[PDB]
């Protein structure tokens, strides 16, 4: 049972010493998921992110299994990719690409993004979603916190532990999975749902880019769930500040009718993306976010 | 140097032997060990109070426990600075957690009443001192080999995902309201349901769904309400009132008739024996 799922996790990870391939371990953060380090590939110089986890103390090992399996099977330039993993006794070490630009959350909460920068971020995220959905993977937890940026402005999606794999005989899910403020109404109300819930969450992330927060953030998560179920498509504070094409893009992401809501493939053709600036335009925002997050300290 | 007032001067490596690791937490590493002069088993938590955020709260918490001991709270013994590590020494309760008993035995109402009474005595003590425990649940109730029942301590982001289910939390907690001591009475009611049903409520629910159910239904639905006596069901109703003013206080519930069917605490030691056999 519980020992069974533990041995199932252990069987998919090679037994070895992470110190033979990686060096320069330096701690950058601690979560309930474990300790996160940066490190360096000793042969190539690649900087990597390594999370250290005590399996004896992980609550939901089945989730770790799913995330590792999904990452191994779905590599893509717009995803924070899995590199390697190691079993060290009762410790699991997971090696991922390292994104030195920080999270999109730091940018949206500390800067003003123009529509060309927002369009660039949206296009990179839609490229990841088109790839994932074409492979029957639904992320279900899209938010700025799970978008990481490279020092060159690259944009990549991370944190797949809430994801779902759909199949022909089970092409929809029904569970209230996600982070409340970003969840689509059909998820909040426990209706059958599919990949377009990620498109809804992307729409909420575009509201983050415009306003600095998802709708209802000042409310408790349960109250926010109630507001999503009862309001449906959220209101912008100042819609008149948006271009006509940006408003149309938002409307298509946040459509209540799932049939009418855009697919990732469809939204990659939207006129709004054609005003996208090059990804280098994001590096001044990264610099501002880093400065701001050292002055809040 | 308030630390010096709470730190004994001896060498704990001389005073204790047979160190055995039994867990790793965010607060530090917990070992079992034995007093070399008396044979008492102890639990020792090792924490590097080396600029760990908000060390003063950890320090003051220790100060509070030394001055405010209680028969139904795990007794604090001593603490030592061992190379800028703080070792906190507690009595060890070798009967294990209530969780192991609940999952490996079926408790009868007399055994449940006894556990509830002992926990209510601890809560009356804490509440009289304006302490809210906030985590009354089966893995924080420890059992002695004589059937003693004790709480392990005083209780010590909107943007983040919920991974586990806070099944013990009162509705006023989950709705992020200001709350008081009676949230512990709610959690006790949930634990009594756990004891009679063998598992915590909401086990098959997603955390967000369980949060909504707690906020709106309040009490979880009993799986088999017909199996509970009238007096036990009334006790549960008094613990699980949604109206905070109507919910019983610890002092009030210590007078409830359900507690008067309590078996002697010795009746718990066969449960401990079963749990150890089942988990070994
Ligand atoms: C912002 C600094 N740059 C950065 N660049 C990459 C990562 C990768 C990761 C990561 C993701 C996933 C797993 N995986 C995959 C299998 C199970 C598992 O845990 C992992 F090990 C790791 Cl290290 C991570 O956490 N962080 C910390 C910040 O993350 C924000 C979202 N929480 C990262 N930060
Ligand atoms: C069931 C095995 N028996 C047992 N018998 C006693 C304890 C005492 C303790 C403890 C309590 C409190 C502090 N204190 C007091 C001041 C700050 C602090 O940390 C402490 F250090 C320690 Cl060691 C502890 O942890 N555990 C591990 C299991 O606990 C379950 C709940 N998590 C114990 N197990």
Coordinates of N, CA and C in Angstrom, one line a residue, chain A residues 33 102-111 113 139-148 158-159 162 177-183 201-202 204-222 224 293, chain B residues 157-163 176 208:
Chain A
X33 N 7.8 21.0 -0.2 CA 8.2 20.0 -1.2 C 9.7 19.6 -1.0
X102 N 13.9 34.4 -12.4 CA 12.9 34.4 -11.4 C 11.5 34.1 -12.0
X103 N 10.5 34.3 -11.1 CA 9.2 34.0 -11.5 C 8.5 35.2 -12.2
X104 N 7.5 34.9 -12.9 CA 6.6 36.0 -13.5 C 5.9 36.7 -12.4
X105 N 5.6 36.0 -11.2 CA 4.9 36.7 -10.1 C 5.7 37.9 -9.7
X106 N 7.0 37.8 -9.5 CA 7.8 39.0 -9.1 C 7.7 40.1 -10.1
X107 N 7.6 39.8 -11.4 CA 7.4 40.8 -12.4 C 6.0 41.5 -12.3
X108 N 5.0 40.7 -12.2 CA 3.6 41.3 -12.3 C 3.3 42.1 -11.0
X109 N 3.9 41.7 -9.9 CA 3.6 42.4 -8.7 C 4.5 43.7 -8.5
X110 N 5.5 43.8 -9.2 CA 6.5 44.9 -9.0 C 6.7 45.8 -10.2
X111 N 6.1 45.5 -11.4 CA 6.3 46.3 -12.6 C 5.0 46.6 -13.3
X113 N 3.8 46.1 -17.1 CA 4.1 45.5 -18.4 C 3.3 46.2 -19.5
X139 N -2.5 20.9 -17.5 CA -1.6 21.4 -16.4 C -2.5 21.6 -15.1
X140 N -3.6 22.3 -15.2 CA -4.6 22.6 -14.2 C -4.1 23.6 -13.1
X141 N -2.8 24.0 -13.1 CA -2.4 24.9 -12.1 C -1.5 26.0 -12.7
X142 N -2.0 26.6 -13.8 CA -1.3 27.7 -14.5 C -1.6 29.0 -13.6
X143 N -0.5 29.7 -13.3 CA -0.5 31.0 -12.6 C 0.9 31.6 -12.7
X144 N 1.0 32.9 -12.4 CA 2.3 33.5 -12.7 C 3.4 32.9 -11.8
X145 N 3.0 32.3 -10.7 CA 4.0 31.6 -9.8 C 4.7 30.4 -10.4
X146 N 4.1 29.8 -11.4 CA 4.6 28.7 -12.1 C 5.1 29.0 -13.5
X147 N 5.3 30.3 -13.8 CA 6.0 30.7 -15.0 C 7.4 31.3 -14.6
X148 N 8.4 30.6 -15.0 CA 9.8 31.1 -14.7 C 10.4 31.7 -15.9
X158 N 6.3 25.5 -15.2 CA 6.8 24.5 -14.2 C 5.7 24.0 -13.3
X159 N 6.0 23.1 -12.4 CA 5.1 22.6 -11.3 C 3.9 21.7 -11.7
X162 N 0.0 18.9 -10.3 CA -1.5 18.9 -10.3 C -2.0 18.4 -11.7
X177 N -9.4 20.8 -8.7 CA -8.0 20.8 -8.6 C -7.5 22.2 -9.1
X178 N -6.6 22.8 -8.4 CA -6.1 24.1 -8.9 C -5.9 25.1 -7.7
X179 N -5.5 26.3 -8.0 CA -5.4 27.4 -7.1 C -6.6 28.3 -7.2
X180 N -7.4 28.5 -6.2 CA -8.8 29.1 -6.4 C -8.9 30.2 -7.3
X181 N -8.0 31.3 -7.2 CA -8.2 32.5 -8.0 C -8.0 32.2 -9.5
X182 N -7.3 31.2 -9.8 CA -7.0 30.9 -11.2 C -7.9 29.8 -11.8
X183 N -8.8 29.2 -11.1 CA -9.6 28.1 -11.5 C -10.8 28.5 -12.4
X201 N -7.1 29.7 -17.1 CA -6.1 30.2 -16.1 C -5.1 31.1 -16.8
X202 N -4.8 30.9 -18.0 CA -3.9 31.8 -18.8 C -4.5 33.2 -18.8
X204 N -6.6 34.5 -16.6 CA -6.4 35.1 -15.3 C -5.0 35.6 -15.2
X205 N -4.0 34.8 -15.7 CA -2.6 35.3 -15.6 C -2.4 36.6 -16.4
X206 N -3.1 36.7 -17.5 CA -3.1 38.0 -18.3 C -3.7 39.1 -17.4
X207 N -4.7 38.9 -16.7 CA -5.2 39.9 -15.7 C -4.2 40.2 -14.7
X208 N -3.4 39.2 -14.2 CA -2.3 39.5 -13.3 C -1.3 40.5 -14.0
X209 N -1.0 40.2 -15.3 CA -0.1 41.1 -16.0 C -0.6 42.5 -16.1
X210 N -1.9 42.7 -16.3 CA -2.6 44.0 -16.5 C -2.7 44.7 -15.1
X211 N -3.3 44.0 -14.1 CA -3.7 44.6 -12.9 C -2.8 44.3 -11.7
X212 N -1.9 43.3 -11.8 CA -1.0 43.0 -10.7 C -1.5 41.8 -9.9
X213 N -2.7 41.4 -10.0 CA -3.3 40.4 -9.2 C -4.4 39.7 -10.0
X214 N -4.7 38.4 -9.6 CA -5.9 37.8 -10.2 C -7.1 38.4 -9.6
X215 N -8.3 38.3 -10.2 CA -9.5 38.8 -9.5 C -9.7 38.1 -8.1
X216 N -10.3 38.9 -7.2 CA -10.7 38.5 -5.9 C -9.6 38.2 -4.9
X217 N -8.3 38.5 -5.3 CA -7.2 38.1 -4.4 C -7.3 38.6 -3.0
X218 N -8.0 39.7 -2.7 CA -8.1 40.2 -1.4 C -9.2 39.4 -0.6
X219 N -9.9 38.5 -1.2 CA -10.9 37.7 -0.6 C -10.3 36.4 -0.1
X220 N -10.9 35.7 0.8 CA -10.5 34.3 1.2 C -10.7 33.4 0.0
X221 N -9.9 32.3 0.0 CA -10.0 31.4 -1.2 C -11.4 30.8 -1.3
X222 N -12.1 30.5 -0.2 CA -13.4 29.9 -0.4 C -14.4 31.0 -0.9
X224 N -13.5 33.5 -2.8 CA -13.1 33.6 -4.2 C -13.7 32.5 -5.1
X293 N 12.6 43.3 -5.1 CA 12.5 42.2 -4.2 C 13.7 42.2 -3.3
Chain B
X157 N -0.1 30.7 2.4 CA -0.3 31.8 1.4 C -1.6 31.5 0.5
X158 N -2.3 32.6 0.3 CA -3.5 32.5 -0.6 C -3.1 32.1 -2.0
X159 N -1.8 32.3 -2.3 CA -1.3 32.0 -3.7 C -0.9 30.5 -3.8
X160 N -0.8 29.8 -2.7 CA -0.3 28.4 -2.7 C -1.4 27.4 -2.9
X161 N -1.1 26.2 -3.4 CA -2.0 25.2 -3.6 C -2.2 24.5 -2.3
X162 N -3.4 24.0 -2.0 CA -3.6 23.1 -0.9 C -3.4 21.7 -1.3
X163 N -2.5 21.0 -0.5 CA -2.1 19.6 -0.8 C -2.8 18.6 0.1
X176 N -11.4 32.1 7.5 CA -10.4 33.1 7.8 C -11.0 34.2 8.7
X208 N -10.0 21.3 -1.5 CA -10.8 22.5 -1.8 C -12.3 22.1 -1.5

